[PDB]
Amino acid sequence: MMGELLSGQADMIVAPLTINNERAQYIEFSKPFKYQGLTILVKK
Amino acid sequence: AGFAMIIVASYTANLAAFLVLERITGINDPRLRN
Amino acid sequence: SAVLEFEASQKCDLVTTGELFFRSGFGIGMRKDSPWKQNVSLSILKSHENGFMEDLDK
Amino acid sequence: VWAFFAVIFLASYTANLAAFMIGLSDRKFQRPQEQYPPLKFGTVPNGSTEKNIRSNYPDMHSYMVRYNQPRVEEALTQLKAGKLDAFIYDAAVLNYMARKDEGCKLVTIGSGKVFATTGYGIALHKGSRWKRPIDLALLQFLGDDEIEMLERLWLSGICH
Amino acid sequence: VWAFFAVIFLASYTANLAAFMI
Numbered sequence A: 001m002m003g004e005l006l007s008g009q010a011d012m013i014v015a016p017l018t019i020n021n022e023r024a025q026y027i028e029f030s031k032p033f034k035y036q037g038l039t040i041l042v043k044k
Numbered sequence B: 001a002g003f004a005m006i007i008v009a010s011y012t013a014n015l016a017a018f019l020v021l022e023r024i025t026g027i028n029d030p031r032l033r034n
Numbered sequence C: 001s002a003v004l005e006f007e008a009s010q011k012c013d014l015v016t017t018g019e020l021f022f023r024s025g026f027g028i029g030m031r032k033d034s035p036w037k038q039n040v041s042l043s044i045l046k047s048h049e050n051g052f053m054e055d056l057d058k
Numbered sequence D: 001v002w003a004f005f006a007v008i009f010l011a012s013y014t015a016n017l018a019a020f021m022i023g024l025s026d027r028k029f030q031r032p033q034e035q036y037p038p039l040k041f042g043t044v045p046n047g048s049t050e051k052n053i054r055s056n057y058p059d060m061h062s063y064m065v066r067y068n069q070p071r072v073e074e075a076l077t078q079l080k081a082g083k084l085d086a087f088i089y090d091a092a093v094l095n096y097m098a099r100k101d102e103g104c105k106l107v108t109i110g111s112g113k114v115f116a117t118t119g120y121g122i123a124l125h126k127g128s129r130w131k132r133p134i135d136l137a138l139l140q141f142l143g144d145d146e147i148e149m150l151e152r153l154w155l156s157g158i159c160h
Numbered sequence E: 001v002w003a004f005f006a007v008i009f010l011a012s013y014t015a016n017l018a019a020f021m022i
Helices: A002-007 A021-026 B003-019 C002-011 C035-050 C052-057 D002-020 D048-056 D058-063 D072-080 D091-100 D131-143 D147-154 E002-020
Strands: A034-036 C024-026
Touching (some): A034 C002, B003 D002, B003 E002, C035 C052, D002 E002, D048 D058, D072 D091
């Protein structure tokens, strides 16, 4: 996504995208709207 | 009597099981931290 | 977190047990020169304040 | 014949059961006119919660003429004494009080949904040169999975 | 008289032992 946006065709990303360093200094973000973490899923 | 007696016996067994249903386990415990 | 728990609730044939060992949010990205960024941040916080967020959530 | 089967079945059943033995959206909070709420849902005097309520439900703000402004400690003391009915305040501080609370008082519903989910920021200046470095350092710390350690050192609790 | 005391005593004993089994 951000690679293709930096390519130039895309102009503004709207997706369930997380927040992390390298992409943060490489492109800034807006204020968060949905909050989550990391979790395991398994069958019973 | 009968059904009532057996249900009271079951309730008494349940209550007896209910009655039977060291606070620091290392420096990592938060009781000492606070 | 949200995706996995929502899918598990939808299917209710699998169990979600892991603890939230991470904290993160979802944002909107755009080029490094954008008044749209400030305005959309204000609009998103407005949506949070008014109650549209959990409205669409429910 | 039948009696023995019945008694063994009931014994198995008894053994199995003994083994198993081992917000304001609510109607009550929605009505300020009703006399049932003994108190007026105390809150901090000039908090962001006040302006949120006044910009969302002015009727609640009007009904909130009586509130425990000065001390959160005195507010929780009165609530424990049975005087106050309910308290409304920031989720993080109430959670911290509950974690270290003596008596283990639940907060809302057992960590129910919080109104206007937000975060804690840093009060910077307009167009400060430190904005980008501050964001970078904060996010690097967040990825460096140590704020969890600081929270466990500071925000620990017993009641769980 | 005696029978009821005996049976309740034995029921309590059985409950206690099954509890210790946990």
